Amino acid sequence: KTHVQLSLPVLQVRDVLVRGFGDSVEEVLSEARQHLKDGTCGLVEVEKGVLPQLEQPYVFIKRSDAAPHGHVMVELVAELEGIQYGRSGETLGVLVPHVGEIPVAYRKVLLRK
Numbered sequence: 001k002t003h004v005q006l007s008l009p010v011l012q013v014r015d016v017l018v019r020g021f022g023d024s025v026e027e028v029l030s031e032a033r034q035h036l037k038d039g040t041c042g043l044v045e046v047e048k049g050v051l052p053q054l055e056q057p058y059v060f061i062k063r064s065d066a067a068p069h070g071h072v073m074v075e076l077v078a079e080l081e082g083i084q085y086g087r088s089g090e091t092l093g094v095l096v097p098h099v100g101e102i103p104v105a106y107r108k109v110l111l112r113k
Contacts, residue, residue, distance in 0.1 A: 003110045005071050006036060008043040008061075009103035011096065013050045016042070018097040020055030025078040025085045032059040032076055032095045036111055042098035043107050046091050056080050059095040062088030064112055071110040 021031035035041035043061065044050060051058065061074040066089075076095075077086035092107060 002113065003073070004036075004113050005069065005108070006039075006041075006111055007106045007108050008041060008095075009098055009101070010093070010105040010107055011042040011044055011098065011101045011103055013044050013053045015101045016044060016054070016096050017099050017101065019053070020057070021059055021095070021097065022057075025057050025080050028057045028059045029076055029078050029085070031097075033113070035095070035097055037113075040098050042096050042101065042103070043093045044096055045093045051094065054094055054096065060084075060088075061092045061095060061109060061111075062086075063090045063092060064088050068110055069108075071108045073110045073112070075112045 021028035057080040065073040
């Protein structure tokens, strides 16, 4: 399937134990996709002071279309020192590994895979 229905656990930034996916744009995008497939991917909603508490490169999920079954359609865009690799709509948040942190909510998305 080109798209996969996922419910992503929304984590508070100060709870997150592993604050990024790796060390290159290509690695974070690869790791993000692997974790999304394995259901070990969390989502941190971006606000003032959230991104400086996480590790670059960042992986964003961004709205790719204006929402089957409640699931917003999203795609991945990485960012490293202010350059984004990808072009998409509004940020739904930043992806991080999930290693058992208690979520505050769940974000139903349809991931272009």
